[PDB]
RNA sequence: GGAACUUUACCAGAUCCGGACAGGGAUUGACAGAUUGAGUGUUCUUUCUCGAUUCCCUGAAUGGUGGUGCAUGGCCGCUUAUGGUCGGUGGAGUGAUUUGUUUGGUUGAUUCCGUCAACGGACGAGAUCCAAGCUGCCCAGUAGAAUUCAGAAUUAUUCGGAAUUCUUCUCUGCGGGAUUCCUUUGUAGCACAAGGUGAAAUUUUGGGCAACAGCAGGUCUGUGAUGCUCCUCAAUGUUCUGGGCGACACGCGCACUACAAUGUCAGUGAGAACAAGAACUACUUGAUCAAAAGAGUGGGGAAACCCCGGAAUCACAUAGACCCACUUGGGACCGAGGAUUGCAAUUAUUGGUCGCGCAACGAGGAAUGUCUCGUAGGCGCAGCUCAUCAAACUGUGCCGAUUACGUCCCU
């Protein structure tokens, strides 16, 4: 319906991004998408998710896959330490530590 | 509640479908040659069958981490209860999975068609295959279309059987223009079903 | 069936000849000798191979055979 | 005491064949009561379409057929005996589900 | 606005389904709750566990 | 591809950006009034919020049942349902090219047997796989049967509590069984015909898979398979509203119903198989101190419920009606009530009641399709499409024949 993202909920699904390492989102636009951080089961409008992806992909930011209408999005090196700096910290992901 | 029984097994089928599609899409250039997996009360543990298993695996496990949590997050299995391991082919000259994916790197390479196919029959026949073909087709020289293949060796067509006997792959391959499709057919040496053979007696 | 193929007169040449003082003019205890020294994985062949070699003991109690050689 | 219903369902003929025949040897080492195995009638699941992809030259038709098996076995033990009887590397496929009869 | 894709989200019709791979909207099998396209389903029906016997 | 919206690609109008990314108090929403098809901030007037998310220029990118199937991949159809296809070494020819791979018999078969400048091989055919028909082991408190004791009815036989036992029927994972096996004829090795044995006697029956070459055959409306193209911010993108794909006393293909007495109507009897079901399918009882269709209440489910699956052809010694006529044949067209599905029945969504039946039609010109035994023909039932609608397709069972077992006249 709009790909206007509020910044409170553009954070929240970087959070996820960072801790979990990695994002699949049904490619349907009418419906939403769910994420467990913490015990919060915040959603996001899967028009929204799909907007905010694009953005780092074309700069390089994420590798990407599609299969029976599920994407599929992992974020680079690049990306990596893009998303340190924006949510200032020095993790490492998850699947990369251990 | 509890689903039914046709339900069940349906249910249950198109699950493995799926799952082969996405690890197909993911460990192609790796060399993804077959998965299986068995359920347990502890876990659902999943078996890959890849000839480069070390760049399947990643550095600490870091790909086999990324692809173990891509599927945890699309069926919502609970944390600790999936489980991927990663097994070694034992030849690689006798799976048309493998040995198509060696024909496509050399295509998108600059590679000789004859010459590229020359290597995949010469490899498979002398890796110990019964026998072979290999068939490229599509725009391979000029704004027509054509069918270029190979033979060698002795290889069914017909029956119920041939579908154990013999073992075929296909792959769609991106040119600077138009589409090329490859095929490679190998059979693998239960007896014929139509062989006799008689004991020599004392 | 009408006619027997080369597959079936083939091997039932061979059986003749590796086991001859096994065999008789009788169909059914030829097809339990035969069954037990040739290996196939069908037994309409099996059936077709006693068949046939029943056939040839009958000639070979007249004259001899082309192709077969007892030695 | 009480009756514990054990049902064995795969898409393979063989796995359920190899399944069932372990667990009668290992119920005649508990010196278990037996019920069965019993050979309940199996389902055919069947889909037909046409094989053409655009609806051109003669209307031409395939089937694909499933099969379904099903076993069942009655036995005479306590809970603690069936658990035991059962807890084996059941091959993939197959799926045994653990009923108390009334 | 508060139209946008109004009739949609009904979801009641031949136009609410989609395949499960192609994501397309015509000649769908639901036969025991299946959901694939007729073009889909000869291509995986191996996976699935359907042969070809007669 | 049975289109009410959607599907929709077409027509008349209104929106949204779903132009990422870079270079040079932004902006997003809202009450009331007006504009409007719209109690749609679409825009205008008036204000009031939300806060760097996007806004204005360019490049670029994305999208598009947009284009070429004569740029392609894949798949499918046909040539072609036939018995075809092809190497190596050797012989012959200046060479293209030939032999094998022929000539006789036989077979559905380039299937086999003899002869031979050949000999060796390969694929196709055959074998393999699936289902039906006969049978062995195993097996049932999700299948059944027999027997004995309590009960109840007629004047031995019937009906519906407790028990024992047991696999004839049902269920099915692996096996058995048929092989020209036996006799005779015509006989000049391969085989054929009649008979026997037998559940089955000739590819046992019905299917599936099927070589080598080709078609400028179809599909870019399946697909996140694509080359190259087109349009791209009041757009061929996308959404919303309305209409169309259903329009006509015209032509053509394929079906359904009939033209009656070997019948129509009204009763009564006996009696299948394959399937599907939310985990929606369906029973019983109300409604019923008064049409049908409906409504409404309790419960039950996957060899356990539906179900002792009460199908229609069919049968009736039913001492029923009609009597050869466009008639109680036929049921097109139209009128007036009422109920149900749906957000929405005005181009009828469908079903039920009464009425119209004065609409052709009395067996069909020239032409023409399919068919050899549980077959043709006839009869219903499930599945699929599906909120509602099957004169269609994919399967299943029930009743069940006439003719030939030949030839090369037509193709
Ligand atoms: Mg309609
Ligand atoms: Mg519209
Ligand atoms: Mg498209
Ligand atoms: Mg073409
Ligand atoms: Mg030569
Ligand atoms: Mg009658
Ligand atoms: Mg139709
Ligand atoms: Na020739
Ligand atoms: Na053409
Ligand atoms: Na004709
Ligand atoms: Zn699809």
């Given at each position: 319906?709009?790909?206007?993202?509020?910044?409170?909920?553009?954070?929240?699904?970087?959070?996820?991004?960072?801790?979990?390492?990695?994002?699949?989102?049904?490619?349907?636009?009418?419906?939403?998408?769910?994420?467990?951080?913490?015990?919060?089961?915040?959603?996001?409008?899967?028009?929204?998710?799909?907007?905010?992806?694009?953005?780092?992909?074309?700069?390089?930011?994420?590798?990407?896959?599609?299969?029976?209408?599920?994407?599929?999005?992992?974020?680079?090196?690049?990306?990596?330490?893009?998303?340190?700096?924006?949510?200032?910290?020095?993790?490492?992901?998850?699947?990369?530590?251990? | 509640?509890?689903?039914?029984?046709?339900?069940?097994?349906?249910?249950?089928?198109?699950?493995?479908?799926?799952?082969?599609?996405?690890?197909?899409?993911?460990?192609?250039?790796?060399?993804?040659?077959?998965?299986?997996?068995?359920?347990?009360?502890?876990?659902?543990?999943?078996?890959?069958?890849?000839?480069?298993?070390?760049?399947?695996?990643?550095?600490?496990?870091?790909?086999?981490?990324?692809?173990?949590?891509?599927?945890?997050?699309?069926?919502?299995?609970?944390?600790?209860?999936?489980?991927?391991?990663?097994?070694?082919?034992?030849?690689?000259?006798?799976?048309?999975?493998?040995?198509?994916?060696?024909?496509?790197?050399?295509?998108?390479?600059?590679?000789?068609?004859?010459?590229?196919?020359?290597?995949?029959?010469?490899?498979?026949?002398?890796?110990?295959?019964?026998?072979?073909?290999?068939?490229?087709?599509?725009?391979?020289?000029?704004?027509?279309?054509?069918?270029?293949?190979?033979?060698?060796?002795?290889?069914?067509?017909?029956?119920?059987?041939?579908?154990?006997?013999?073992?075929?792959?296909?792959?769609?391959?991106?040119?600077?223009?138009?589409?090329?499709?490859?095929?490679?057919?190998?059979?693998?040496?239960?007896?014929?079903?139509?062989?006799?053979?008689?004991?020599?007696?004392? | 069936?009408?006619?027997?193929?080369?597959?079936?007169?083939?091997?039932?040449?061979?059986?003749?000849?590796?086991?001859?003082?096994?065999?008789?003019?009788?169909?059914?205890?030829?097809?339990?000798?035969?069954?037990?020294?040739?290996?196939?994985?069908?037994?309409?062949?099996?059936?077709?191979?006693?068949?046939?070699?029943?056939?040839?003991?009958?000639?070979?109690?007249?004259?001899?055979?082309?192709?077969?050689?007892?030695? | 005491?009480?009756?514990?219903?054990?049902?064995?369902?795969?898409?393979?003929?063989?796995?359920?064949?190899?399944?069932?025949?372990?667990?009668?040897?290992?119920?005649?080492?508990?010196?278990?009561?037996?019920?069965?195995?019993?050979?309940?009638?199996?389902?055919?699941?069947?889909?037909?379409?046409?094989?053409?992809?655009?609806?051109?030259?003669?209307?031409?038709?395939?089937?694909?057929?499933?099969?379904?098996?099903?076993?069942?076995?009655?036995?005479?033990?306590?809970?603690?005996?069936?658990?035991?009887?059962?807890?084996?590397?059941?091959?993939?496929?197959?799926?045994?589900?653990?009923?108390?009869?009334? | 606005?508060?139209?946008?894709?109004?009739?949609?989200?009904?979801?009641?019709?031949?136009?609410?389904?989609?395949?499960?791979?192609?994501?397309?909207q015509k000649a769908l099998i639901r036969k025991y709750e299946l959901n694939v396209c007729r073009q889909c389903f000869r291509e995986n029906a191996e996976h699935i566990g359907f042969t070809k016997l007669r």
């Amino acid at each position: 319906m709009s790909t206007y993202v509020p910044k409170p909920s553009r954070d929240n699904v970087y959070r996820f991004f960072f801790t979990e390492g990695v994002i699949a989102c049904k490619k349907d636009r009418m419906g939403t998408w769910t994420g467990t951080l913490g015990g919060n089961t915040f959603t996001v409008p899967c028009i929204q998710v799909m907007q905010l992806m694009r953005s780092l992909k074309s700069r390089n930011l994420i590798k990407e896959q599609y299969a029976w209408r599920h994407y599929y999005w992992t974020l680079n090196d690049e990306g990596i330490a893009y998303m340190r700096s924006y949510l200032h910290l020095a993790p490492s992901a998850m699947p990369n530590t251990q | 509640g509890p689903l039914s029984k046709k339900r069940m097994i349906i249910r249950d089928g198109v699950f493995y479908a799926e799952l082969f599609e996405f690890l197909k899409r993911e460990l192609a250039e790796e060399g993804f040659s077959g998965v299986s997996y068995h359920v347990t009360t502890l876990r659902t543990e999943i078996v890959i069958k890849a000839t480069k298993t070390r760049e399947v695996l990643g550095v600490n496990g870091r790909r086999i981490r990324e692809l173990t949590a891509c599927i945890q997050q699309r069926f919502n299995y609970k944390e600790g209860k999936l489980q991927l391991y990663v097994e070694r082919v034992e030849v690689r000259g006798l799976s048309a999975m493998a040995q198509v994916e060696s024909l496509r790197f050399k295509l998108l390479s600059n590679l000789q068609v004859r010459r590229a196919a020359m290597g995949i029959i010469r490899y498979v026949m002398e890796s110990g295959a019964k026998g072979c073909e290999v068939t490229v087709g599509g725009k391979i020289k000029g704004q027509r279309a054509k069918s270029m293949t190979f033979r060698d060796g002795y290889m069914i067509k017909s029956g119920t059987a041939h579908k154990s006997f013999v073992d075929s792959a296909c792959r769609h391959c991106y040119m600077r223009a138009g589409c090329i499709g490859v095929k490679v057919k190998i059979m693998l040496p239960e007896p014929l079903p139509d062989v006799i053979t008689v004991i020599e007696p004392k | 069936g009408k006619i027997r193929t080369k597959t079936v007169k083939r091997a039932s040449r061979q059986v003749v000849e590796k086991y001859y003082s096994k065999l008789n003019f009788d169909f059914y205890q030829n097809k339990r000798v035969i069954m037990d020294v040739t290996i196939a994985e069908s037994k309409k062949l099996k059936n077709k191979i006693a068949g046939y070699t029943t056939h040839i003991m009958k000639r070979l109690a007249r004259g001899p055979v082309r192709g077969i050689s007892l030695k | 005491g009480q009756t514990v219903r054990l049902t064995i369902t795969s898409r393979n003929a063989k796995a359920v064949e190899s399944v069932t025949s372990q667990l009668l040897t290992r119920a005649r080492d508990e010196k278990v009561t037996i019920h069965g195995p019993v050979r309940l009638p199996t389902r055919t699941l069947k889909i037909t379409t046409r094989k053409t992809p655009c609806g051109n030259g003669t209307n031409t038709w395939d089937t694909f057929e499933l099969k379904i098996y099903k076993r069942i076995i009655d036995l005479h033990a306590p809970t603690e005996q069936v658990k035991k009887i059962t807890s084996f590397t059941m091959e993939s496929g197959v799926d045994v589900s653990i009923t108390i009869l009334d | 606005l508060d139209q946008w894709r109004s009739r949609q989200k009904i979801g009641m019709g031949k136009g609410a389904r989609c395949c499960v791979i192609c994501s397309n909207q015509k000649a769908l099998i639901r036969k025991y709750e299946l959901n694939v396209c007729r073009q889909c389903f000869r291509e995986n029906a191996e996976h699935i566990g359907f042969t070809k016997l007669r």
